[PDB]
From a paper:
However, while 45LNIYQY50 (R1), 47IYQYGG52 (R1), and 137VTQVGF142 (R5) formed unbranched and elongated amyloid-like fibrils, the 129TASNSS134 (R4-R5 loop) segment formed scarce and more amorphous structures. The 45LNIYQY50 (R1), 47IYQYGG52 (R1), and 137VTQVGF142 (R5) segments bound the amyloid indicator dye ThT and demonstrated dose-dependent amyloid fibrillation curves with short lag times. 45LNIYQY50 and 47IYQYGG52, which are overlapping segments from the R1 repeat, adopted very similar structures. Both segments, as well as 137VTQVGF142 (R5), adopted a classical amyloid steric zipper architecture, with two possible dry interfaces between paired β-sheets. The β-strands were oriented parallel to each other along the β-sheets. These three structures are class 1 steric zippers, as defined by Sawaya and Eisenberg according to the organization of the β-strands and β-sheets. In each of these dry interfaces, the chemical properties governing fibril stability, i.e., buried surface area and shape complementarity between sheets, resembled those of eukaryotic steric zipper structures. Specifically, the R1 45LNIYQY50 and 47IYQYGG52 segments and the R5 137VTQVGF142 segment formed fibrils that bound the amyloid indicator dye ThT and formed canonical amyloid class 1 steric zippers. These segments contain Gln49 or Gln139 (marked in bold in 45LNIYQY50, 47IYQYGG52, and 137VTQVGF142), which are critical for fibrillation and cannot be mutated to asparagine without interfering with curli assembly. The R1 segment 47IYQYGG52 and the control segment 129TASNSS134 showed a milder effect on the fibrillation rate of Aβ1–40.
Numbering used by the authors:
A (entry chain B), B (entry chain B), C (entry chain B), D (entry chain B), E (entry chain B), F (entry chain B), ...: 1 to 6
């Protein structure tokens, strides 16, 4: 699981 | 799962 | 699952 | 599953 | 499944 | 399934 | 299934 | 199935 | 799990 | 220009 | 320009 | 320019 | 420019 | 420029 | 510039 | 510039 | 500049 | 500059 926000 | 937002 | 938003 | 929005 | 919107 | 919108 | 709209 | 609209 | 915000 | 092959 | 191969 | 291969 | 391979 | 390979 | 490989 | 490999 | 490898 | 390896 890889999550990137911004 | 790969999630990218922005 | 690959998700890209922006 | 590949999803791209933007 | 490949989905592209934009 | 391949879907392209835009 | 291939769908293209736009 | 191939569908193209636009 | 990898999460990046900012 | 729209090109589809396959 | 839209190109789809495969 | 939109290119999809595969 | 949008390129997708695979 | 958006590039996705894999 | 957005590049994803893998 | 956003680069992801792996 | 954002770089992720692995 | 953000770099992540591993």
């Amino acid at each position: 699981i890889y999550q990137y926000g911004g």
